[PDB]
Amino acid sequence: KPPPIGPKRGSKVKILRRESYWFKNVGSVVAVDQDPKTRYPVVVRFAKVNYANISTNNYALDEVEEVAA
Amino acid sequence: RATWLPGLNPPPYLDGNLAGDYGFDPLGLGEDPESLKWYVQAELVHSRFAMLGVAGILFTDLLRTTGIRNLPVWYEAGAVKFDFASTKTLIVVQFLLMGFAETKRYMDFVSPGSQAKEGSFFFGLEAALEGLEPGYPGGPLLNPLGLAKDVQNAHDWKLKEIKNGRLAMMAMLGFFVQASVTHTGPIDNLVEHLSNPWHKTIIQTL
Amino acid sequence: DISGLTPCKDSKQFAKREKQQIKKLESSLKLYAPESAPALALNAQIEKTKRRFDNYGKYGLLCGSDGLPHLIVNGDQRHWGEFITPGILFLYIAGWIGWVGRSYLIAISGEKKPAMKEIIIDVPLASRIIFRGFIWPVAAYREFLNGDLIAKDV
Amino acid sequence: VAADPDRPIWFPGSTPPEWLDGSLPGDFGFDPLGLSSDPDSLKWNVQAEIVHCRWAMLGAAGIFIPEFLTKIGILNTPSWYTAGEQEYFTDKTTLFVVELILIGWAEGRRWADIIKPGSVNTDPVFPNNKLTGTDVGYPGGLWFDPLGWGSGSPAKLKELRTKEIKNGRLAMLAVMGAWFQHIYTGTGPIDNLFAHLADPGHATIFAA
Amino acid sequence: SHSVKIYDTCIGCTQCVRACPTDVLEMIPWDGCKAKQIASAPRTEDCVGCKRCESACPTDFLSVRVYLWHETTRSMGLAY
Amino acid sequence: MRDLKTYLSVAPVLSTLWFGSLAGLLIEINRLFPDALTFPFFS
Ligand code: CLA
Ligand code: CLA
Ligand code: CLA
Ligand SMILES: CC(/C=C/C=C(C)/C=C/[C@@]12O[C@]1(C)C[C@@H](O)CC2(C)C)=C\C=C\C=C(C)\C=C\C=C(C)\C=C\[C@@]12O[C@]1(C)C[C@@H](O)CC2(C)C
Ligand SMILES: CC1=C(/C=C/C(C)=C/C=C/C(C)=C\C=C\C=C(C)\C=C\C=C(C)\C=C\C2=C(C)CCCC2(C)C)C(C)(C)CCC1
Ligand code: SF4
Ligand code: SF4
C-alpha cells in the first residue's frame, strides 16, 4: 500500500535472521523502502558495529520483529 | 527536610512518607522499590531485636557490676548450663517457635491478608494476625495496649521506634567490638571512660 | 595432626629449615661490620625469618616430612585461616571489583557513545560507584531476585 | 565581584587569563599553568586558597609569636618544629582523633557550603541561630563575624578580602620558610632572623 | 574453479567488483533493491579466491560469497 | 584544566595511578604484615 508497510522510522526492532551479527539483538529502524518489489527494505541502524565495522543492514519484514517497548 | 548530611539532595526513590527516612542511601540499596520494602521490614525487625538485646545487656550488667545479681558477662553468657533444660534443646525449641513466628511474618509480608483468613488455625486465633500494615502487625496479641491504633498517622511513634532502634543496633555493634578487643562488659567500659575520658578510649588501647 | 602431617610447632624438620636459613644468612653476615647498613639489614632479615617460622608454628600449620607448611583446604574448622576465611576475604573484594564495574557499565550504557567512557573513565561516576560494591553480596542477591542481575534475551 | 580589566597584575605587560576577570578579591592574573581554567575548579581553588591562607596565618602566629615572646619577651615555649614530640594531658594519637572528629564536622559543613552554596546556615540544634553569609568562604555569622565587619559595600568587602588573602599568602610563604629553615638550619626562625640581622651577608641559606 | 555466488541481500554498491582484481564479477540490472542492480559472477574461472569481494560486502553477514573449490593454474595465480 | 583531567582519567594513566596506589598498599601490607600464610584472627 502507499501508506507504510513496515515498522516506523525509529521503532526499535529485533532481528530474527539467524545469519546476521545482531541476531536476537535490538535495533533502530531508520528507513523502510516502500517499493513493493525489494526483498529487504528494512534499513536498521544498530548501536554496536559488526565485524566489518558496519552498524547498518537491510532486513526483510518477516526477518524482523518489533519489541513491546 | 533534614536528610542525614546537608548539601546533598535525598534520593528520589525514597522521601517523606517512611519511618524516619532522612534520605541516607548513598550505596543505592533502596533504589528498587520492592527491595526497599523488604529492607524496611528487615530494618524494623533488626532494630527491635537489637533494642531487646541492648536492654537485656545493659540491665543485666547494671545488676552485675553494681552487684544486685550474679549474672554472667554478656560475652560469656551462652554457656550457662540450665538445670531444667539444655542448650541443645533450647536451640531446637527456638527454631520451632521462632520459625512459626517469622514464617508467619513473612507470609504476611508477601500476602498481607494471610494468617487470618482460612485454615490458619493458631488456637482459634485467626483474627489477631490481621496485620493492618507491613512491619506493624497490630492486634490484641501483638499490641495489647494499642498505643498506636492507627499506624499511617502514627509517624511520631514509628519515628521514635526506628530512631531508638537504629541507635540500639549501633550500640549492639558497640557491644560486639568493644567487648572483643577489651573483653569486659559495656558498663565496665563506660565507667572506665567516665573516670579518665582522655586516657581510656578506643585508641588508648595501644 | 591430620593427613599424616605433624604440626609445625612440634616439627623437627621445620626447626631444621629455620636453623639452616639462619646459618645461611649468618654466613653472609661475617663479611661486614655489625653496625653498618648491610649487617643491620641482614639482622633484620634474620629476625624476620625467625618470627616467620615462629608465627607459622603458633598458627597450627601442618608441616609434612619435608618440613614445609602444608595448607588444609578441606574445610576443617582449625584450618579456615588457610583457605576459607581468606577465600571469603577474596570473594568479597573480587565481587566488589565485578559489581562496581558492572554498575559502571550499566551507568554509561545510557550514554550517546558509551565506549568513550570505557576509555576516558568517568572518575566522578566510578568514585560514586567505587564504594557501592561494599554491599555487593546483598545488592547482587536482590538484583538476582528482582531479575536485574541476569539480563533477558530481548 | 566586579571585573577590573586594568588591574595591577603579577607580571606587568602580560595579558592575564580570561578566567580571571578581576572579579575575585585579589586576582592579579597569576595562573600560568591554568589550574583554574574551569569555573568550578576556580570556585574550589578560591576556597582552598582562603582556608590555606587562614590556617597558615594561625600557623605563622602560633610559630613566630611563641618564638618572638620567647627569645626577647621572655617566656617558655619548647619549639614549633619539635612541639609534636612534647607531651600533654592526652595521648598523641587520642587528641589527634579528637581534633579530627571536631574539625571534620566544620569541614563537612564547609564541603556542604561549597557544593550547595546555601545549605548549612541553620544551627541544627537551635534553628533560630543563623549565619548571614551569601558569599561562599565568608560566613557572616556571630561565631565568625560578631563585629559586623564582614558586610557592607562589595567594593569595601573586596578590598578587605584581598587584604585577608594578601596577609595569608605571605603567611603560607612564611610557614614553609620556617619549615625549610628549621630543616636546613638548626635553630628556630626568630633566631635565624637575628643571625641574619647580625651579618646579612654571611648568615644566609648559603654555607659553602 | 572457485564458486562465487551472489545472494539476494545485495544492495548494489559495486564494491565487490571494483575491489575484484581479476574481472570475475560484474553488475547487472535487478529489481530487488533501491539501486536496481546486483552483482553476478560469470568469470569464475578467473577467480583466485582472494575474497576482496566479500571483504567489501556491506551486509549483515555477506551477499557475495566465495567458495574454495577445484584449484587450477589461474585460480592458483601462477605465472608459470 | 578540564582536558588535563580528561587525560588523567584515561585508561592507562588511571590504570597506572590505580595500580601504583594499590601496589603501594599491598607493599606496605607485606612490609607491616610480612610472611603471611594463614589468617590467624578468629582462627
Ligand atoms: C595553598 C595554595 C594556593 C592555592 C590553592 C591558591 C589558589 C589560587 N590562587 Mg593563590 N597564592 C598562593 C597560594 C595558593 N593560591 C600563595 C602562597 C601565593 C603567593 C606566592 C599566591 C599568589 C596568588 C596571586 C598573586 C593570585 C593567586 C590566584 C589564585 C587563583 C588562581 C590560580 C590557581 O588556580 O591556583 C591553584 C593553585 C594550586 C592548585 C596550588 C599549586 C600546587 C603545586 C603543586 C605547587 C608546586 C610548586 C610550588 C612553587 C612549591 C611551593 C614551595 C613554597 C615553599 C614556596 C586560585 C584561587 C590568582 C587569583 O585569582 O586570585 C584570587 C592571583 O591573581 N594566588
Ligand atoms: C615571608 C617569607 C620569608 C621570609 C621573610 C624569610 C626570611 C629569611 N629566610 Mg626563609 N624561606 C622562605 C620564605 C621566607 N624566608 C621560603 C618560602 C623558603 C623555601 C624556599 C625559605 C627557605 C629558607 C632557607 C633554607 C633559609 C632561609 C633563611 C632565611 C633568612 C635569611 C635570608 C636567606 O638566606 O635568603 C634565602 C631566602 C629565600 C630562599 C626566600 C625566597 C624569597 C621569598 C619568597 C621572598 C618573600 C616575599 C617578600 C616579603 C616580598 C618581596 C621582597 C622584594 C622583592 C620587594 C631570613 C630570616 C636562611 C636562614 O635561616 O638564615 C638565618 C636559610 O638557611 N629561608
Ligand atoms: C594466584 C596465585 C598466588 C597465590 C594464591 C599467592 C598467594 C600469596 N603470595 Mg604469592 N605470588 C604469585 C602468585 C600467588 N601468590 C606470583 C605469580 C608471584 C610473582 C609475581 C608471587 C610472588 C610473591 C611474593 C614475592 C610474596 C608472595 C606472598 C604471598 C602471600 C600474600 C599475603 C599477603 O600479603 O596478603 C595480605 C593481604 C593483602 C595484601 C590484601 C589487603 C586487602 C585490603 C586491606 C582490603 C581488605 C579490607 C576490606 C576493607 C574488607 C574488610 C571487611 C569489611 C570492611 C567488609 C600469599 C600466600 C608474600 C608472602 O608472604 O608469601 C607467603 C611474598 O612475600 N607472593
Ligand atoms: C596551610 C599552611 C600552614 C598551616 C600551619 C599550621 C596549622 C601550623 C601549626 C603549628 O605551628 C603551630 C601553630 C604550633 C607548632 O608547635 C605546631 C604546628 C602544628 C606546626 C601552609 C600552606 C602553605 C602553602 C604554600 C606555601 C603554597 C604555595 C603555592 C604556590 C607557590 C602556588 C603557585 C601556583 O599555583 C599558583 C598560585 C598559580 C599556578 O597557575 C602556578 C603555580 C606556580 C603552580
Ligand atoms: C566450601 C568449599 C569447598 C567447595 C565448594 C564448592 C563445591 C562450591 C561450589 C559452588 C558452585 C557450584 C557455585 C555455582 C555458582 C553458579 C552461578 C551460576 C553463579 C552466578 C553468579 C553470578 C552471575 C554473579 C555475578 C557477579 C557477582 C555477584 C560478583 C561480581 C559481579 C558479577 C556481576 C560478576 C572446598 C571443600 C573445595 C574448599 C573449602 C570451601
Ligand atoms: S559488494 Fe556486496 S552489496 Fe555491494 S554490490 Fe557487491 S554483492 Fe552487492
Ligand atoms: S575472490 Fe577475488 S577474484 Fe574471486 S570474485 Fe572475489 S575479489 Fe574477485
Short mmCIF file of C-alpha atoms in Angstrom, two decimals, chain C residues 17-105:
data_model
loop_
_atom_site.label_atom_id
_atom_site.label_comp_id
_atom_site.label_asym_id
_atom_site.label_seq_id
_atom_site.Cartn_x
_atom_site.Cartn_y
_atom_site.Cartn_z
CA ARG C 17 64.73 -25.26 57.95
CA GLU C 18 64.83 -22.38 60.43
CA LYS C 19 68.36 -23.20 61.60
CA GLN C 20 69.59 -23.71 58.04
CA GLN C 21 68.24 -20.39 56.77
CA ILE C 22 69.64 -18.61 59.83
CA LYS C 23 73.08 -20.14 59.30
CA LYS C 24 72.86 -19.19 55.62
CA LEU C 25 72.08 -15.57 56.49
CA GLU C 26 74.80 -15.55 59.16
CA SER C 27 77.40 -16.86 56.72
CA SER C 28 76.61 -13.76 54.65
CA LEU C 29 76.86 -11.66 57.85
CA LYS C 30 80.52 -12.27 58.82
CA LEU C 31 81.68 -10.15 55.85
CA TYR C 32 80.55 -6.72 57.15
CA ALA C 33 80.85 -4.83 60.40
CA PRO C 34 77.98 -5.48 62.85
CA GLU C 35 76.87 -1.81 62.90
CA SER C 36 76.80 -0.93 59.18
CA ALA C 37 73.75 -0.94 56.94
CA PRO C 38 74.36 -4.41 55.37
CA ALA C 39 74.75 -6.15 58.72
CA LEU C 40 71.76 -4.30 60.16
CA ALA C 41 69.64 -5.32 57.17
CA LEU C 42 70.84 -8.91 57.48
CA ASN C 43 69.95 -8.95 61.17
CA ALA C 44 66.53 -7.51 60.33
CA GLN C 45 66.01 -10.26 57.74
CA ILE C 46 67.16 -12.77 60.36
CA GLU C 47 64.57 -11.58 62.88
CA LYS C 48 62.04 -11.57 60.04
CA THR C 49 62.84 -15.22 59.31
CA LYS C 50 62.74 -16.27 62.96
CA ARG C 51 59.39 -14.53 63.62
CA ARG C 52 58.10 -16.00 60.32
CA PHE C 53 58.91 -19.55 61.43
CA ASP C 54 57.55 -18.96 64.93
CA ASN C 55 54.33 -17.48 63.52
CA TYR C 56 53.87 -20.48 61.25
CA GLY C 57 54.40 -22.59 64.36
CA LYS C 58 51.90 -20.77 66.55
CA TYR C 59 49.09 -20.73 63.96
CA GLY C 60 48.86 -24.53 63.97
CA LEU C 61 50.12 -25.02 60.43
CA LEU C 62 50.81 -28.63 59.47
CA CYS C 63 54.37 -29.35 58.33
CA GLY C 64 54.94 -32.58 56.44
CA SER C 65 58.00 -34.78 56.24
CA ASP C 66 59.69 -32.20 54.01
CA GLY C 67 59.25 -29.67 56.81
CA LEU C 68 57.16 -27.06 54.97
CA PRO C 69 53.64 -25.89 55.91
CA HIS C 70 51.02 -27.91 54.03
CA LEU C 71 47.76 -25.98 53.87
CA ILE C 72 44.49 -27.81 54.52
CA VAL C 73 41.59 -26.76 52.29
CA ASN C 74 39.05 -29.49 53.13
CA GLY C 75 37.08 -27.24 55.49
CA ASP C 76 38.48 -28.21 58.87
CA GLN C 77 37.47 -25.55 61.39
CA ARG C 78 41.05 -25.34 62.67
CA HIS C 79 42.26 -24.55 59.12
CA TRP C 80 39.77 -21.95 57.91
CA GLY C 81 42.59 -19.43 58.16
CA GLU C 82 44.30 -21.36 55.37
CA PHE C 83 41.60 -21.14 52.66
CA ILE C 84 38.06 -20.37 53.80
CA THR C 85 38.45 -17.09 55.71
CA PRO C 86 40.89 -15.64 53.14
CA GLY C 87 38.67 -17.19 50.48
CA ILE C 88 35.74 -15.14 51.74
CA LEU C 89 38.11 -12.18 52.03
CA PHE C 90 38.98 -12.69 48.36
CA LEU C 91 35.47 -13.24 47.03
CA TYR C 92 34.28 -10.08 48.86
CA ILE C 93 36.91 -7.96 47.05
CA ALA C 94 36.54 -9.78 43.74
CA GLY C 95 32.79 -9.26 43.76
CA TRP C 96 33.43 -5.65 44.72
CA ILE C 97 35.53 -5.27 41.57
CA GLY C 98 32.95 -7.02 39.42
CA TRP C 99 29.97 -5.21 40.90
CA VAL C 100 31.40 -1.70 40.65
CA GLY C 101 32.49 -2.50 37.10
CA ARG C 102 29.07 -3.86 36.18
CA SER C 103 27.21 -0.93 37.74
CA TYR C 104 29.60 1.39 35.91
CA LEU C 105 28.95 -0.25 32.55
#
